[PDB]
Write an enzyme that holds these catalytic residues in place. Sequence first.
Site, PDB file in Angstrom:
ATOM      1  N   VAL A 100       0.858  -1.176   0.000  1.00 52.47           N
ATOM      2  CA  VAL A 100       0.000   0.000   0.000  1.00 52.47           C
ATOM      3  C   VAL A 100       0.898   1.231   0.000  1.00 52.47           C
ATOM      4  O   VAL A 100       1.930   1.261   0.680  1.00 52.47           O
ATOM      5  CB  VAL A 100      -0.925   0.019   1.235  1.00 52.47           C
ATOM      6  CG1 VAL A 100      -1.788   1.273   1.255  1.00 52.47           C
ATOM      7  CG2 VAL A 100      -1.812  -1.217   1.265  1.00 52.47           C
ATOM      8  N   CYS A 101       0.496   2.253  -0.761  1.00 52.96           N
ATOM      9  CA  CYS A 101       1.201   3.534  -0.800  1.00 52.96           C
ATOM     10  C   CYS A 101       2.672   3.320  -1.116  1.00 52.96           C
ATOM     11  O   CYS A 101       3.005   2.543  -2.014  1.00 52.96           O
ATOM     12  CB  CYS A 101       0.887   4.244   0.510  1.00 52.96           C
ATOM     13  SG  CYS A 101       1.316   5.998   0.509  1.00 52.96           S
ATOM     14  N   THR A 102       3.570   4.009  -0.408  1.00 56.56           N
ATOM     15  CA  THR A 102       4.992   3.898  -0.721  1.00 56.56           C
ATOM     16  C   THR A 102       5.603   2.567  -0.309  1.00 56.56           C
ATOM     17  O   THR A 102       6.804   2.375  -0.526  1.00 56.56           O
ATOM     18  CB  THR A 102       5.750   5.083  -0.133  1.00 56.56           C
ATOM     19  OG1 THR A 102       5.398   5.237   1.245  1.00 56.56           O
ATOM     20  CG2 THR A 102       5.398   6.354  -0.888  1.00 56.56           C
ATOM     21  N   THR A 120       1.649   3.577  -6.737  1.00 52.52           N
ATOM     22  CA  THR A 120       2.081   4.077  -5.436  1.00 52.52           C
ATOM     23  C   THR A 120       1.375   5.410  -5.191  1.00 52.52           C
ATOM     24  O   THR A 120       0.518   5.832  -5.968  1.00 52.52           O
ATOM     25  CB  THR A 120       3.612   4.190  -5.347  1.00 52.52           C
ATOM     26  OG1 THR A 120       4.015   4.375  -3.983  1.00 52.52           O
ATOM     27  CG2 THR A 120       4.142   5.348  -6.176  1.00 52.52           C
TER      28      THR A 120
END
Lengths: 227, 229
Positions: A100-102, A120
Site C-alpha cells: 500500500v502507498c509507498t 504508489t
Amino acid sequence: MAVQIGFLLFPEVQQLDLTGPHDVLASLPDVQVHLIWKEPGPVVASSGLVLQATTSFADCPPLDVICIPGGTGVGALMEDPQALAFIRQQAARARYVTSVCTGSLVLGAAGLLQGKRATTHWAYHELLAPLGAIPVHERVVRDGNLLTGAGITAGIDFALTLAAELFDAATAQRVQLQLEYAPAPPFNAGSPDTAPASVVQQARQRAADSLHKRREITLRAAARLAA
Amino acid sequence: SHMAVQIGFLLFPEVQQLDLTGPHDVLASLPDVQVHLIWKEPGPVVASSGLVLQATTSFADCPPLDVICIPGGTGVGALMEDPQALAFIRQQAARARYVTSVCTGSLVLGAAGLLQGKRATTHWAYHELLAPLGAIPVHERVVRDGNLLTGAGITAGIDFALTLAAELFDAATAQRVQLQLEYAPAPPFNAGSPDTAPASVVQQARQRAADSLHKRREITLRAAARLAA
C-alpha cells in the site's frame, strides 16, 4: 489451513496504511494476521501512535499474503539488506505479494517490481520506473499475484479487492457492509486531478524534501539491482 | 508545543480499532496537535481484532481537551454502564470545543446524557438505539448539531475527521490533508450501505447482529433509566 496474512511493521510507518487493511482482513473467517518486525514489541508510527509487532522475522510462519505498508520509514527499508532479504524469502512462496502507498517502493528495492505493472502514492509515482516497474495510474493494480494500492487510504479499497480474491465477492461485500464503507468525502481534493491548484501546490511543496531524498535512495537501490 | 490543540480518544478493551486509528492519522496530520489515548491507566489495550494499542494517559491525568472523541466497538456495551468513564466524558464535554464520536461511540455519548434533544448518527445496524437515549436519529454519514459531531459506522471516521479538520482549521487545510491521504475512494463493490448492498447480504448481516442488538437494547434502556432518575 488458516490463511496467514503478514504486515511488515517498521519504525515510522504511516499507520493507516496498515490499520485500514488490518481491520478489513481480520474480519474474514479462517485468517491469522501477523505484524512482523525484527523483534516483537513496540514499534512507533510516524504520528507517534505505538503499535506492537507480534513476531520476529524468524518466528513468522510461511505467509499466504505479505503486505508492505508505506510511510516516512520506507527510505531506511529500501537500503536495509535484512528487511529486503526477508521480503524476498516470503515473496518466494506467498500466494500474494502486496503493498500500500509507498510500500511498493520497498518491493521495488527488493527487485520484485521488475517488469510488473504497479502503482504508489501520487506524489512519489515517478520513482516506480527506475525500480523497473511499468507505472500505472490506477488506485489498485494487479499483475499476476502482485497487488499494489495507491496512496494511504487506498489501502481500504486494496483490502476489499484482496478479500474477494482470497474468498469471493459475497464475503467482500459482507465486510464492506459491516464497515459501512460507503464513503462521502466532504471535499473533492483526494487526487491531484480534482483538487484545487492551490492545494496541489501546497501538498507538492510539503513533499519536496522527502521526494528529493527518495530520488537519491531509489537510484542507489536500482544500481544495486543492476550490479 | 504548549499551545497545541489537545485531542483525546477514549481507548477501551474491545474497541473497533479503525474507528480510532482512521481519525487519528487524519488529525495527527494537522499543525501543532497533541493526541492522547485515554483509559483508566496507561498501558496496552487490546482491540476487537487483537491489534494491541497503547493508552498514553489515565482519566485523572488527562489535560483539559479541545476535542474528545469516543470510538465504537464490541466494548461499548460495558462503557455504557461504566460510571468512571461516563463521568470523565461529561467532565471533558463541559469545556471541550467539540464533543465527538464515531460508529457506536455515539451510544456512549448517549449513555452520558449528551445526546438529549440532539441530532446524531451511528452505525446503520444500531441506529434504532439512538432515540431511547434522547437523540434525534439522522441517517447521514456525518451529523453536526452545534459542537456535537457524530460519524456513522466504522469507516465513516475518515469522513468525520476531515469534516472536523475543516472546523478546527479551514477548508484549505482539510483539503490538503485529503490530498496527502489520496482520499479519492473507489470501492470495488457497492455494498457499503444497507440501501445498496445485495438484499442477501443485508439479511445475513441483520441475522448476525440480532443477538448483539437485543443485548444492547437492554443496556440502552438501563442507561436511559439512569438519566431519568
